Amino acid sequence: RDKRALEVERTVSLAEVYAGLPKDNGPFSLAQEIDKLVSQGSGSAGSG
Amino acid sequence: VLTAGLNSQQANTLHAFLDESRSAALSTYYIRQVAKAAAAIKSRDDLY
Secondary structure, eight states: OOOOOOOOOOOOHHHHHHHHHHHHOOOOOHHHHHHHHHHSOOOOSHHH | GGGOOEEEEEEHHHHHHHHHHHHHHHHHHHIISSSSSOOOOOSHHHHH
């Protein structure tokens, strides 16, 4: 049963993942939100 | 009126805050004023 699998490499940019969220999910620019969250003592961005 | 000026992140933050403060208060009130004696509730853990 140990059939040879295809070996696939995929690159993922999280900024694209967050920027691309549906509007209802609170899409955001990752670098900008990090800057704000670091400057602040707390907070969040996005959802779910 | 004041909460009407909040964005969704702020609204979620506000509500989370209020719910936590509010349950502490309700739980305290309940144990001392509402809880029936039959229920041996001494603290918040027992109330749960």
